[PDB]
Ligand binder design. Structure first.
Ligand SMILES: Nc1nc2c(ncn2[C@@H]2O[C@H](COP(=O)(O)OP(=O)(O)O)[C@@H](O)[C@H]2O)c(=O)[nH]1
Ligand SMILES: Nc1nc2c(ncn2[C@@H]2O[C@H](COP(=O)(O)OP(=O)(O)O)[C@@H](O)[C@H]2O)c(=O)[nH]1
Ligand code: ALF
Ligand code: ALF
Ligand SMILES: [Mg+2]
Ligand SMILES: [Mg+2]
Ligand code: NA
Ligand code: NA
Lengths: 335, 341
């Protein structure tokens, strides 16, 4: 946005701004939700896509509640800020303090005896560099249960995640790590469970820098091995050591490119992965979702003509219309 | 491992048997089987652990489905027939002396019968290894559990692997080596998952934590190993098997045993744990736990001592002396395994 906001104003803001309000039903953008095993790097991937560090990452079980994020477009007031449902009248401008608030509110309802809840935390990020969009961070799938956590926890997480991911209007980010065999991927498992067609599922390969010497991801990345409707995108997020070093997101971006480029087995694929390519890819995908709608250029044509003697009338109405097409035709090859 | 379980299994039989000819007994079997199975998710390193336990390289490994069929190995100590060889049930009167080639035969026989390269089969491949140096045990290599299904695979295969593994695992005469990779979160462990199922008390289960050398920087396994993160009935044992690059350059068991013993005692978080890590330690922990099993048949000295004062109390008659000389040299042995374990 980048690409996607240009498209959005081109109607929703500036040129569907035309005459509405006579039974026009009805621009909902589908959510994007991360799924994958416990500690596959979901929170790291989601941050990267939003472009700022604001989600607790690490251990261990760290995301223990669904975190429903709504990005919100703002009257280009250079006034960027975040705000929680559970804390009205409180605005943040330091995403580290948002990150910290996410951790406290999560503790509030659980404890370091490591239980998960299904009641979401709601958070909004206001920005003129974003478009209206819900994003969803989720606790990772486990197989066991331990520390002290409930005995039921295993499928409680399985339903929580299923509860979001079921909805057809949900883009699924299936996060699988490259240091386990794909056959063992909880994320590939679940994203078949709910979206057999694999139609709204993008696959993300994390921890490529963590592979056993003698192995490499080339076969998965290059769609050789397990094949998806969309090409696998590989990422290198930052390490646990990098988390205690408080390495920042701009450093991690560089690092990530000093891997896909400086690694031999990967170089010929570099211009096609990293979190940035993934967000582009995500961008290009939802670009198609609203364009699919633009065959409402027929309801532009609805009026226009069948106005031509509706009484002069308005060469003015048929001036908006000119200017509507102006826009709904000056957004041709965005995808 | 063998050593002190052969020099106590042998310090018997030459006791119970070659003495307690109190006829009409019952009956040296059952827990003179306890099979040992490796379980865990695909490629968590089951085969590597198993051969480390046996002591010879003879099982294929990788990276991708490699093990695709149960491999039941009942190993054999010989009449000091000091000549190492093995034989596959499926091709009899065939003796192998090349172990690198026994390995080749496990794959071929797997390929021949699975059809596809990623297909599995619950038809066990029966192997025996003859070497007068290692005692009488059954070992069972098994395909790693998986979650999805890749490539040229069935579908139910997820359930087919679970079922197959579960079948050698439900039976109580079975030791589980629950094999868990350290570079994943223990909460996501398939090994631990099924082990705790078929063995809730955790009584016949050993936790093996592999791939400790692959841990992401800024994490280590000390908490798991000191028994703080997931308590088991027996201390966790960490191993470092050969990596896929080692395999590709054919690094051998001696160099991998050297490697491992250098890892633990050289990396500073593990140094304090070193000599309770390593597959050689695992094998020791295993033999000892078998020792306890047998040693738990020796309130049998009581099914002796009966034959005693019930005869120390009793033209050809007093001949006795001998069945008492023998049932007192059984004390030479069954009283020379005393402080063992
Ligand atoms: N080295 C490396 N570490 C990673 C990568 N991705 C995630 N991690 C680490 O994985 C652990 C869990 O990451 P997190 O984003 O919280 O995963 P989540 O529980 O799925 O949300 C942390 O210790 C991260 O440092 C990666 O690509 N490379
Ligand atoms: N670096 C490292 N690699 C390992 C370790 N254990 C196993 N591997 C690798 O993991 C892959 C699977 O090993 P394998 O013995 O076949 O495990 P299995 O398939 O469960 O029987 C091979 O590439 C091994 O070299 C370890 O401790 N460290
Ligand atoms: F272990 Al997490 F989100 F904290 F998968
Ligand atoms: F990954 Al395997 F036997 F090849 F568990
Ligand atoms: Mg998380
Ligand atoms: Mg195996
Ligand atoms: Na985590
Ligand atoms: Na494997």
């Amino acid at each position: 946005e980048n690409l996607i906001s240009l498209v959005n104003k081109i109607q929703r803001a500036c040129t569907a701004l035309g005459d509405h309000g006579d039974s026009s039903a009805l621009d909902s953008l589908p959510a994007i939700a991360v799924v994958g095993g416990q500690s596959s790097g979901k929170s790291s991937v989601l941050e990267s896509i939003v472009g700022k560090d604001f989600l607790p990452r690490g251990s261990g079980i760290v995301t223990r509640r669904p975190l429903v994020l709504q990005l919100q477009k703002i009257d280009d007031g250079t006034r960027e800020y975040a705000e929680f449902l559970h804390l009205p009248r409180k605005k943040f401008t330091d995403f580290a303090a948002v990150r910290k608030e996410i951790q406290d509110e999560t503790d509030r309802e659980t404890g370091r005896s490591k239980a998960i809840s299904s009641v979401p935390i709601h958070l909004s990020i206001y920005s003129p560099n974003v478009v209206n969009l819900t994003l969803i961070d989720l606790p990772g799938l486990t197989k066991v249960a331990v520390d002290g956590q409930s005995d039921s926890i295993v499928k409680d997480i399985e339903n929580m995640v299923r509860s979001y991911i079921e909805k057809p209007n949900c883009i699924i980010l299936a996060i699988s790590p490259a240091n386990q065999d794909l056959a063992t991927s909880d994320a590939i498992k679940i994203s078949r469970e709910v979206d057999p067609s694999g139609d709204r599922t993008f696959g993300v390969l994390t921890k490529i820098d963590l592979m056993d010497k003698g192995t490499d991801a080339v076969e998965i990345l290059e769609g050789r091995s397990f094949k998806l409707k969309y090409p696998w995108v590989g990422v290198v997020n930052r390490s646990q050591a990098d988390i205690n070093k408080n390495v920042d997101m701009i450093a991690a971006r560089k690092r990530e490119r000093e891997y896909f480029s400086n690694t031999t087995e990967y170089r010929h694929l570099a211009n096609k992965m990293g979190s940035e390519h993934l967000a582009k890819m995500l961008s290009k995908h939802l670009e198609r979702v609203i364009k699919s709608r633009i065959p409402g250029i027929q309801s532009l044509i609805n009026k226009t003509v069948l106005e031509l003697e509706t009484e002069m009338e308005r060469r003015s109405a048929i001036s908006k219309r000119l200017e509507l097409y102006r826009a709904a035709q000056s957004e041709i090859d965005a995808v």
